[PDB]
Design a protein around this ligand. Sequence first.
Ligand SMILES: O=C(O)COc1c(Cl)cccc1Cl
Length: 167
Amino acid sequence: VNSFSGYLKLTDNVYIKNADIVEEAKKVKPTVVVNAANVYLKHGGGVAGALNKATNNAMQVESDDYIATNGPLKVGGSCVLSGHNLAKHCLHVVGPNVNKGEDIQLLKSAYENFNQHEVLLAPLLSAGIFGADPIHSLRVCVDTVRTNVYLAVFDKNLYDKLVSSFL
Ligand SMILES: O=C(O)COc1c(Cl)cccc1Cl
């Protein structure tokens, strides 16, 4: 049993809810919250800007030190950093950004990072301002992640559309 509440069960391991991931993280304090990161860990908007704002910019300060030491992530890659006031850990995952021309095949590689964690609170990778089709992102998630993932869809229409169209 875990603390996640109000989710619709899609599969053995994937759950979904219409929720603000920031508000959900603050309520649950999960072991792992996933950030929709870019390779520079520049957290300006969408999930990353919202998560970072909720940490009072401490996520960005930590991230800048990570990049200064290690250099940029790979598209499809990830790093584990602090979850600050939101979670124990934040798994920063870089899905491909369609609005930068990145290979959508890298979305599966991005989701494979989730398999290193038994339970996660996450957004749909490459959705929102990363420009991918969220229906596609949910299909890749279900077909790639084997650990228990609790998805936070920000848009109600998409939440209502993702459920209705789910095979
Ligand atoms: O709902 C999501 O989580 C991602 O997609 C979005 C977002 Cl973030 C905002 C407006 C519309 C859509 Cl379809």
